[PDB]
């Protein structure tokens, strides 16, 4: 995407070009939590 700040996309783009950009961040970020929460669920099984 054009920028790693959300509001610097949203101020600079319309309702459709922003949907193409923003969903990239929604993807990448979601995969960043889906990673992190997995990593914690496994560590948690280590500490358990």
């Amino acid at each position: 995407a054009i920028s790693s700040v959300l509001n610097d996309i949203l101020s600079r783009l319309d309702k459709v070009e922003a949907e193409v950009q923003i969903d990239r961040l929604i993807t990448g970020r979601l995969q960043s939590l889906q990673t992190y929460v997995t990593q914690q669920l496994i560590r948690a099984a280590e500490i358990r």
Binding site: R12, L13, E17
Partner: protein, 49 residues
């Protein structure tokens, strides 16, 4: 910029630097003269913000 008497040949394409001034892009967007006004890292409305 948009109203010089002559433009350059596209091999020697002239480049004018714009700086230390107010820009109102609605003047251009509202101009029924332009066949093409596509923006490539912003949207043409949001230019004013």
């Amino acid at each position: 910029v948009f109203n010089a008497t002559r433009f350059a040949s596209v091999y020697a394409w002239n480049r004018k630097r714009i700086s230390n001034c107010v820009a109102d892009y609605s003047v251009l967007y509202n101009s029924a003269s332009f066949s093409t006004f596509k923006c490539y890292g912003v949207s043409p409305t949001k230019l004013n913000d």
